[model samples]
Target: MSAETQMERKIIDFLRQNGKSIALTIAKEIGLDKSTVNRHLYNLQRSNQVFNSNEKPPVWDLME
Candidate 1:
């Protein structure tokens, strides 16, 4: 897979195991930068793979 694809998969797997989470925690857990994680989260949002709760600080999770 491409680099983005790998990172996206990492993000997805993390969410699957951890349930709802914010980008900061996700980045820390996955050894990635928060900005990079946020970028992928938005891309995942666009593709309907994940969504945010739109809270004070949004929490993200798999769409299903």
Candidate 2:
């Protein structure tokens, strides 16, 4: 798989295991930069695999 797809998978797995989280925390836990995590999160959001809370900083979680 492509690097981007792999990263997205990691993000999804992290959320699946940890429940809701923020981008910074995900990035730190996954050993990726926050910017990269946010970018992937946006892509995941567009594809409806994940979503963000309607609050500042935007807590992220996998779509049920």
Write down the lDDT of every candidate, Cα atoms only: 0.72, 0.73
Please give each candidate's TM-score: 0.66, 0.66
TM-score, structure 1 vs. true = 0.66
Q: Write the per-residue lDDT of candidate 2 for residues 1-64, one digit (tens) a residue.
A: 4576566857657755875588877877787799988888888788777787566766687645
Model 1 residue 1 lDDT? 39
Give the backbone clash total of model 2. 0
Best by lDDT: 2
Clashing pairs in 1: none
TM-score of 2: 0.66
The C-alpha RMSD in Å for every predicted model, in order, reads: 3.5, 3.5
Cα lDDT, model 2, residue 56: 72
